[PDB]
Amino acid sequence: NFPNSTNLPRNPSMADYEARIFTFGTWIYSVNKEQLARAGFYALGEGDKVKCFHCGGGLTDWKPSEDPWEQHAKWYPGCKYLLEQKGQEYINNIHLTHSLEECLVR
Ligand SMILES: C[C@@H]1CN(CC(=O)N2CCCC2)CC[NH2+]1
Ligand SMILES: [Zn+2]
Structure with a gap:
């Protein structure tokens, strides 16, 4: 499934922060x-699988050093929720950061 880059959320049932939070239950992950949730994610109930309510972009295997908004920007750069909550300056910063990383680690 392709990522939603329209201004309309793919899962509007999960558009409220309240809603997303209930999905987690007791959360053991790092x-x-x-x-x-603040970054737009709700839990799938399979390990630490989260899905963004807006773009639908899914992310898994959360390391303690990984930020939700950073990972959101990394994998779902076209998410209009992300664009709105964070701004384009932030998204560019994140991208330049990760690309510069993949060329210093590399
Ligand atoms: C949270 C972070 C996410 N990473 C990538 C991932 O989960 N993806 C699933 C769809 C394509 C990118 C793995 C490490 N932990
Ligand atoms: Zn998103």
């Missing part, structure tokens, strides 16, 4: 659930 990334903060409220942080994840």
Whole structure:
């Protein structure tokens, strides 16, 4: 499934922060659930699989050093939720950061 880059959320049932939060339940994983919800993510109930309510972009295997908004920008750069909450300056920063990384680690 392709990522939603329209201004309309793919899962409007999950558009409220309240809604997203309930999906987690007791959360054992290394990334903060409220942080994840704030970044538009709700839990799938399979390991630490989250999905963004707006773009539908899915992310998994959360390391403690990984930020929700950073990972959102990384994999779902076309998400209009992301664009709106963070701004384009932030998204460019994130991209330049990750690309410069993949060329210093590399
Ligand atoms: C949270 C972070 C996400 N990474 C990539 C991922 O989960 N993807 C699934 C769809 C394509 C990118 C793995 C490491 N942990
Ligand atoms: Zn998104």
